[model samples]
Target: MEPSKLSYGEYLESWFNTKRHSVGIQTAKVLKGYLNSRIIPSLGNIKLAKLTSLHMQNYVNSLRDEGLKRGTIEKIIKVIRNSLEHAIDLELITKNVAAKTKLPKADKEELEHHHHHH
Candidate 1:
């Protein structure tokens, strides 16, 4: 038996900072913030081999518990999905398990402004 020494988190961070260099600063800031505040704190310590759709669902549930709105959760999910997509490209995972995850229903709202005015 051997201690788990692999660092998928390092790989993910490198992938973000290197391959995703074209992404804007603010976008990267949001992503880094989300990863640090939400995703990493909850799931970063988990092993890559054991990562599953259910784990992703749990992250969503945890986010909901944190008072994040539906739209905000959706955005977080998008980041997770995109990161997993990159992982898939790098052959880290067999498939994007995040795809099977479902978000809570969005609330109906009225917009005060519109750009279609003629």
Candidate 2:
């Protein structure tokens, strides 16, 4: 028998399987939404063993270029980090590459107070 060698996508599917039973409906919905709409579309094909911090960084930058909201982006990053942590625990990889990638902060406009004209 050979050791397990799964791609990031393969691990993601397994991870979600384990999580679905334990997570609440709303949490499962949100996780699946992000997984389907964002993370998998962007980084799914990379082998877990080959994934790197730079890949994570590039993905985040591309998301920014797509004008995704900061909060949404952060949530996506959180999911990736969480998944990678799981992989780490399973000994699938050495570290959470996404942990070293920085999430962009909200823009000034989003942080500023809005005043309505009288």
Candidate 3:
């Protein structure tokens, strides 16, 4: 397992296969759909080392613009994030950029900690 420049695509492909051996049964199928149908087209090109919070945020915005449900949006990101957690588990990376990604919040807190712009 060399610390080569593994892409997000590379990690997810390998990890999901290995992970599917566990309880990821139904979840495994679902994740594959998320990967093949969406994540791959959207983020497959990013090197795991190069992906950042900004990338994550931009992706979320794109999904929102597509009018996908918030629930679907959250699940897609959650899978991406879960994969990142494992990617780090192997010492391939030092951080999970997605961990710092901000998802659209529903409400009060958004208005409260509202940082700037109108």
Predicted candidate 1 versus true structure: per-residue lDDT over 1-105, tens digit per residue: 333443546555766686346766766787777777887766677766567778887887788789987556766676677777877786777788787764576
**Per-prediction TM-score to the true structure, in the order listed:** 0.76, 0.78, 0.78
User: What does candidate 2's lDDT look like per residue over 1-118, in tens digits?
Assistant: 3254677777788888788888767667877788877777667777787787777878887886878775667767777887899988977777788877645545323542321224
Which one wins by TM-score: 1 or 3? 3
Model 3 lDDT per residue over 81-111, tens place: 8788997898877888887654466322332
- The per-model lDDT (C-alpha) reads 0.67, 0.73, 0.74
Inter-residue clash pairs, candidate 3: none
1 against 2, candidate with superior lDDT: 2
How far does residue 87 in candidate 3 sit from its true spot (Å)?
A: 1.2
Q: Which 10 consecutive positions of candidate 3 have the poorest summed lDDT?
A: 107-116
* Candidate order (lDDT): 3, 2, 1
